[PDB]
Amino acid sequence: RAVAVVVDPIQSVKGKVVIDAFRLINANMMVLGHEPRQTTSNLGHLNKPSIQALIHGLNRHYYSITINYRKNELEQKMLLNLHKKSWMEGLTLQDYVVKEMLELAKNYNKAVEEEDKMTPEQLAIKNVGKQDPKRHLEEHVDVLMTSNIVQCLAAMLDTVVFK
Amino acid sequence: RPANHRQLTFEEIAKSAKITVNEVELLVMKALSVGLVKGSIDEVDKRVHMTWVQPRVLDLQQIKGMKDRLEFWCTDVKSMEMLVEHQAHDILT
């Protein structure tokens, strides 16, 4: 096969699948049809994005190939063990900061809350005759939820650890 | 002594010390000059407050009493921990 491997090392931190692989088909088979691929249904299920418009310019005797990221039962669950059980508090016993994020969160909440409450000045009737619908409850439900619940469990740390 | 008493009288230090009242002050300051205790010199009542001390040799009976109060801590915090988690068990989903 002699399959190439093409990569760009400046892309992302967890997401991109940057690797690219090919198969140059010969110019001697210019008589016969180009890339038969007996079924061309999983090849069509490879064909999904029509990726890399300059390579699709380079579709003269080129095509990318399927690369799955297959399982290693010998390795997958233990990589998951490494990953999770080394990132859930490391030893899982460490933090179970807290007293200045009080002021940080009250700033980050209230300073956005007054502009969150400005818009009922401008709310009215004649349904489409007004145009500015934007939500305002964002990051003051959930940031306050996570903030205050985790720091009241931080107030529970003393009774949890200490007796 | 039982855990610390949190405040320890001049009679106690002077009685184990077989010394007068007016030397346990020099004693606790001298212990600070030694640097084995970080204590607060509670002598508004001549009754002294305790901090960390450099320990002495754990005896066999002190291994056993350490097992006693230590497993007291261990299984009490573990059992009441399982009770807290038994109340916290209903909302996992």
Next chain:
Amino acid sequence: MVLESTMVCVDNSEYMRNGDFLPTRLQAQQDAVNIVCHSKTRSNPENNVGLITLANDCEVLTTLTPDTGRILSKLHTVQPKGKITFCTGIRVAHLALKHRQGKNHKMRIIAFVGSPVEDNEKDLVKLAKRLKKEKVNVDIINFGEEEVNTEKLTAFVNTLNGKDGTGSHLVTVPPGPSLADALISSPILAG
């Protein structure tokens, strides 16, 4: 030529330092390493020679490799000092030769013992019928001093072979003044 693997088993115990055997006993076993490495240069260079001790450790510093110029550099500062254990020496050399590269090479190994080893004859007969079930002839050349007429290693020579595989030749040590090449002249005559 012939395909084998000979593991030189030097002694680095504290008995190999005097001059009863010629102007250094270190030089005596060193000339022995010289003649066996030149002899395996004169043998097939497809074969391989590695170093090992029996005393104070089981010291592998070179691999069982067909080169020996680095072994000639490894002659220096051997500093023979410790306590002999040849009974682990046979087995450590045999696993070193079960870490080889080819099976068409035979296994004719030499050994140099120069100290009183706490070796039961039951130990070395376990090793000896082990080599009967592992196909190794061993030609030991006694150095140093343990006995003027060695018997435990004579028993290993007896209990290694029978009727076909008599490749156990034991040069017992001549504990008085005997030469540097007169000891190794008989195995270069017949191993």
Next chain:
Amino acid sequence: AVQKVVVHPLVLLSVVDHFNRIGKVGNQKRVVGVLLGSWQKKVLDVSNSFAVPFDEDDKDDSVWFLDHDYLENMYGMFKKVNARERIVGWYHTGPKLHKNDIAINELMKRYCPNSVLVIIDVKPKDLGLPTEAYISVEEVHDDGTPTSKTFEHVTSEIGAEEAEEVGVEHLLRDIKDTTVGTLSQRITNQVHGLKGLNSKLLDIRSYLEKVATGKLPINHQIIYQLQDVFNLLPDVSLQEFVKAFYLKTNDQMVVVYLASLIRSVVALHNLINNKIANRDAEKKEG
């Protein structure tokens, strides 16, 4: 001599593949391979490593084999293609060490004068972080024995490097990112309570080992002293924190003030749009 380590998972997978290389053949004991490293501070880093063949019979745990020629050859390879790296130690896959490991350590402490091992587990379920560090120094002894050459447990971690998780978090695919607000805290509660107080109860099982046994190093030097660092709180009955209930109320104070005020404002968040859009949808639905 070693402050801590910064160890990437790539070298652990580089252990895993050679574990695959030995699971298909006659496996006598375990894997002994080279651990390269990027030693910069008294902290440690590893970017990569490779293995070396190894067998070991068990009669006097002294028959054990490496190939220093092969080792230094592939070291010269990876040193030429990357001059950052150098050897820093070794590793083994069997989670319990044995007495031959000091001979392994001191026999490879000749290239660089430190050689830190790495315990790992190819089937880990109960441990915390796989990565472990020892160092071979001497305290000689209280009884000052002839060279009590002891492995000394250096602290360890899994390291971190930018964009090395590109494969990882794409592969595993199952991660629920940012579960703050749900059940991560109680997973840490179950595991830290139970799985730390079982470490505590096995410490007191080791105390029962000191009761019925344990003459050996009974260890009245570090055990009760770091346990006195614990015994900063002798938490006996009557609970002794009359001088801390008001401090606990002070802990409750600010957070419950935030809770009261802010969640009243959260009801005030929900109700407005809920009522307005609710009756909008309700009586403008037809």
Next chain:
Amino acid sequence: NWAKFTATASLGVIHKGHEKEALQLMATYLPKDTSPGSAYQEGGGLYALGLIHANHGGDIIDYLLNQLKNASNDIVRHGGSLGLGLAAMGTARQDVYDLLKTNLYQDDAVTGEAAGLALGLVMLGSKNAQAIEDMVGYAQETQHEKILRGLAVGIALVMYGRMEEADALIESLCRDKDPILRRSGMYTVAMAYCGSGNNKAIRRLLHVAVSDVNDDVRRAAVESLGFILFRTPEQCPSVVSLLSESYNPHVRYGAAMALGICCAGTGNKEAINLLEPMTNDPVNYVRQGALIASALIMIQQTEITCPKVNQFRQLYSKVINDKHDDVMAKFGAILAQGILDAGGHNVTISLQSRTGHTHMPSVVGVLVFTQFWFWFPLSHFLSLAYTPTC
């Protein structure tokens, strides 16, 4: 491959029935009388003989099993093995259990899938306790996608209409690795609950349909409702319309297939009305599959009942008379036309007869018809889902 195989297979699709004249009509088309490209002008000949002798076998055990036993490799034996299992239902064929596993020895190309299918068809709803062991304690230790997916379809096919009798094994398939046994557990509960409104399958069905991160198994899990809900088909569209708006073309594609394979004997206007914006999708092949399912929904269907017949015919004209559509949209379009006039509006599909007995080759045909990513004559088996309405 399929030029050869489809060319000699469409003749046998045309020769459905045709009991006696097979040999003296394919005298030129014996496996040794053709000289194929590689193996499929000689494979599809025995495939067409299996289609000719579908469910009515004469010498189509000994004859076929010998000519596959006297066959060069595994790369030929395919269609003969499929029709062999198809005609060998309940004939207690032992060689189909004997020589297939030791014919592959580890795996095959696609005739390992054929092996799973053949033993499943001869052991339909059997609880083949010999082959519970010798299939699902076998589908773990090799590595490819074809062999494992085909044994997955085979261990789906071996268990059928069980209604209780497999479900611990099904969750034992659920606790396995990513692409194989969970997928097959979905297909096996899709076959074990055929004809009933059991609310047991729907639990793990919806659960693995949306909670999972592998997406083909999600597509399978939303395919399963048409397999289990054909007796009372008027339950699906009102709730699969919400499945129609998923993130992925996987679940949207299966949601387009579900309205079809649930109700294709009927011409309900609402399922048509909800297929309409689904064949107005941005993604191409989900529209393709929606059109396929609507061609299934409009077989035999006059215009006087629901007038969308001519609407979708001229829409098929629209998608077939332009070039800038999907590549296999035309594949699906003339497929939709051949389905749309099947026999000349003579045959139809029904997974269930009127008297309460099911019509099991129709169920087999649709579960066959879904997995056309390889072995395209899974489409060819939709002749087996056709009925004598006379």
